[PDB]
C-alpha cells in the first residue's frame, strides 16, 4: 500500500481492531469449548442409562415371554403398550449456537397407548421407559455435534486472525513507518542542510568579494 501518515493511522486502527476482535473471538471460542465439554460429560454420564434401561427392558421381555410365550408381533409388533413413536423438535440457543431440542412419544408429546400385552405394563415400565433415556441421549449427541462444528469454525477463524491477519498487518505498519520516517524525514533534513550550505557559500563569497575590494 502507498505509505502516508493517514495510511499509517489507518493501519494502526486496523491492527487495534483486529486485536480486539481476536480477543472477542477467543472468549467466544472458550465459552463454546466449555459448553462442548459440559455436553460431552453429560453424554458420557447418560451412556450408562443405555445399559441400565436396556437391562430392565430385557428383564421385562423375559418376564413377558415366560408369561405369554411368543409375542404376537407381526401386525402390531406387540412387546409394548406405550410408545406411539412420533418426534417433535425444538431449537435452543447457547452462546449463539442453535442447539436442537428433541421430544417424542413416551419422552414428551405425541404419545398414545392402547391395551397392551400381558406384561405390557411391565414392558412399558421397562422397554418404553428407555425412551426418555434414548431421547436425552439423542439430544445430547445433537448438541455435542453442533457445538463441535461451531467450535471448529470459531477456532479456525481465531487461528487465522492470530496467524495471518495480525502478522500481515504489523509488517505493513513497520514498512509504512520506515518509508515515512526513514526516507521523508531524512530527505527533509538533507534538503534543508543543502540549502543552509548554499546560504553559507553565498555569504562566504560575498565576504571574500568585499575583502578583495
Amino acid at each position: 500500500v502507498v505509505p502516508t501518515v493517514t495510511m499509517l493511522g489507518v493501519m494502526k486502527s486496523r491492527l487495534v481492531g483486529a486485536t480486539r476482535g481476536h480477543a472477542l473471538l477467543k472468549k467466544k471460542s472458550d465459552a463454546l469449548t466449555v459448553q462442548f465439554r459440559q455436553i460431552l460429560k453429560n453424554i458420557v454420564t447418560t451412556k450408562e442409562s443405555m445399559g441400565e434401561v436396556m437391562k430392565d427392558s430385557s428383564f421385562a421381555l423375559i418376564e413377558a415371554k415366560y408369561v405369554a410365550g411368543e409375542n404376537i408381533k407381526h401386525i402390531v409388533l406387540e412387546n409394548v403398550q406405550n410408545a406411539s413413536i412420533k418426534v417433535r423438535s425444538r431449537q435452543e440457543n447457547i452462546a449463539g449456537v442453535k442447539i436442537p431440542k428433541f421430544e417424542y412419544f413416551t419422552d414428551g408429546e405425541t404419545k398414545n397407548d392402547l391395551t397392551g400385552l400381558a406384561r405390557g405394563g411391565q414392558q412399558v415400565q421397562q422397554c418404553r421407559a428407555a425412551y426418555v433415556k434414548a431421547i436425552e441421549l439423542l439430544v445430547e449427541l445433537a448438541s455435542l455435534q453442533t457445538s463441535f462444528l461451531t467450535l471448529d469454525e470459531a477456532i479456525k477463524t481465531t487461528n487465522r486472525r492470530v496467524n495471518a491477519l495480525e502478522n500481515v498487518v504489523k509488517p505493513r505498519l513497520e514498512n509504512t513507518i520506515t518509508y515515512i520516517k526513514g526516507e521523508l524525514d531524512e530527505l527533509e533534513r538533507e534538503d534543508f542542510f543543502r540549502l543552509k550550505k548554499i546560504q553559507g557559500y553565498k555569504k562566504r563569497e560575498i565576504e571574500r568579494q568585499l575583502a578583495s575590494s
Binding site: 472477542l24 472468549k27 467466544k28 465459552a31 440457543n93 447457547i94 452462546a95 449463539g96
Partner: protein, 158 residues
C-alpha cells in the same frame, strides 16, 4: 503542583509533544472522545488513566484508610464490567451468570452516576468515597476479593 493540559494532535500519543512529555512527568489523565460522545460530562477514561505515584496520596494520616482498597476494587470491577459487556455483545447475554449481570449493572451505574459529575457538583473526597462504597456494596462481601480484611467489616455494613 502542576496539572499541565496538553493537546495531543490526531487523537494519538505518538505525537512528539505528548510522547516527549510522557517521560518527564509521572502520570496521564486522558480525555476520551467516546465518553464525550456518550454524553458523560467528565469524559476522563479512568481505566487507561493512572498516576505513577498515586500511592503517596493514599494513606492513613492524610485522606482515609480505605482509599487504596476502594481504588483497586473499582479499577478491577470496571475492567471486569467492560469485559462482560464485550462478551454479552457476542454471547447473546442469555448465558451470562449472575455475577456477569452484577458487573454489567455496576458498569452502568459507574458510568452514569459516578463519572458523570455535574459541572458544579463539588464533591469532597469523603463523600466521593462514600459514593464509591455505595457502588461497591452491591457485590457480596466475600466477592470483593481485592479488599483486605478489617475494611469490609468496617464499611460494607453501610
Amino acid at each position: 503542583t502542576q496539572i499541565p493540559i496538553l493537546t495531543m494532535p490526531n487523537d494519538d500519543i505518538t505525537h512528539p509533544t505528548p510522547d516527549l512529555t510522557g517521560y518527564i512527568t509521572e502520570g496521564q489523565i486522558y480525555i476520551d472522545r467516546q465518553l464525550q460522545n456518550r454524553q458523560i460530562y467528565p469524559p476522563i477514561n479512568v481505566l487507561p488513566s493512572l498516576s505513577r505515584l498515586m500511592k503517596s496520596a493514599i494513606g492513613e494520616g492524610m485522606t482515609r484508610r480505605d482509599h487504596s482498597d476502594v481504588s483497586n476494587q473499582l479499577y478491577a470491577n470496571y475492567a471486569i464490567g467492560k469485559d462482560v459487556q464485550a462478551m454479552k455483545a457476542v454471547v447473546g447475554e442469555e448465558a451470562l451468570s449472575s455475577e456477569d449481570l452484577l458487573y454489567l449493572e455496576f458498569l452502568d451505574k459507574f458510568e452514569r452516576k459516578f463519572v458523570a459529575q455535574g459541572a458544579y457538583d463539588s464533591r469532597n473526597i469523603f463523600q466521593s468515597l462514600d459514593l464509591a462504597w455505595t457502588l461497591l456494596r452491591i457485590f457480596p462481601r466475600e466477592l470483593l476479593h481485592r479488599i483486605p480484611g478489617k475494611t469490609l467489616d468496617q464499611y460494607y455494613s453501610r
